[PDB]
């Protein structure tokens, strides 16, 4: 199951340290996406509707590189 | 993998909101029915 799908706080705390990622939080829309998704009014459709907005896509793609210990196979 | 990635975003978002914005703890099993 989604056991190691959960990220360790170290990796998450590194997000705020990332000059690139923190700069994304400067977007009033992006931060609204974040808080909306967390409240979970309907995370089901939000997870879809958020991946279409380039702002949240940037945020997502940025946090992945910071929290993913997963190497790029054989790159 | 998007199945993994999207859930990973949930960890990212919730961490930030936790020390940046509100820091609230609404997502808890405060139900005393159990």
UniProtKB/Swiss-Prot annotation, chain A:
Does the entry annotate any disulfide bonds, and if so which pairs?
none
* Chain coiled-coil ranges: none
* Domain of life per record: Eukaryota
Localization, UniProt: Cytoplasm; Nucleus
Q: What disease has this protein been linked to?
A: PEHO syndrome: An autosomal recessive syndrome characterized by progressive encephalopathy, lack of psychomotor development, severe intellectual disability, early onset epileptic seizures, optic nerve/cerebellar atrophy, pedal edema, and early death.
Q: How is this protein organized at the quaternary level?
A: Thyroid receptor interacting proteins (TRIPs) specifically interact with the ligand binding domain of the thyroid receptor (TR). Requires the presence of thyroid hormone for its interaction. Interacts with NUFIP1. Interacts (via HIT-type zinc finger) with the RUVBL1/RUVBL2 complex in the presence of ADP.
The name of this protein is Zinc finger HIT domain-containing protein 3
Species per Swiss-Prot/TrEMBL record: Homo sapiens (Human)
Q: Which residues of the full protein are shown?
A: 85 to 155 of 155
Swiss-Prot record, chain B:
Q: Which cysteines are joined by disulfide bonds?
A: none
Q: In which tissues is it expressed?
A: Expressed in spleen, thymus, prostate, testis, ovary, small intestine, colon, peripheral blood leukocyte, heart, brain, placenta, lung, liver, skeletal muscle, kidney, and pancreas.
Q: Where in the cell is it found?
A: Nucleus
Query: Which residues lie in coiled coils?
Result: none
Record note on quaternary structure = Interacts with FMR1. Interacts with ZNHIT3. Interacts with NOP2, NOP56 and RUVBL1.
This chain's function reads: Binds RNA.
Name under which the protein is recorded: FMR1-interacting protein NUFIP1
């Amino acid at each position: 199951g989604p056991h190691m799908d959960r990220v360790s706080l170290q990796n998450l705390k590194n997000l705020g340290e990332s000059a690139t990622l923190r700069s994304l939080l400067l977007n009033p829309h992006l931060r609204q996406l974040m808080v909306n998704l967390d409240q979970g009014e309907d995370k089901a459709k939000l997870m879809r509707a958020y991946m279409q907005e380039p702002l949240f896509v940037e945020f997502a793609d940025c946090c992945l590189g910071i929290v993913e210990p997963s190497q790029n196979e054989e790159s | 993998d998007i199945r993994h990635e999207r859930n990973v975003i949930l960890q990212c978002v919730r961490y930030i909101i936790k020390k940046d914005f509100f820091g609230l703890d609404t997502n808890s099993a405060k139900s005393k029915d159990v």
